[PDB]
Every structure is written in C-alpha cells, then in structure tokens.
From Swiss-Prot:
Organism for this UniProt entry: Streptococcus pneumoniae
Family in the record: Belongs to the ComC family.
Top-level taxon: Bacteria
Positions in coiled-coil regions: none
Record-given protein name: Competence-stimulating peptide type 1
UniProt function note: Acts as a pheromone, induces cells to develop competence for genetic transformation.
Compartment(s): Secreted
Amino acid sequence: EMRLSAFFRQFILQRKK
C-alpha cells in the first residue's frame, strides 16, 4: 500500500541539509 522510488535513497541519502 505504498508507492515510492528514488526519493529517500537519494534524498536522505543525499541530504545536504
């Protein structure tokens, strides 16, 4: 029941701030 993709693994994981 979830849908996601390249978000976090390249957001939180590329979270400069």
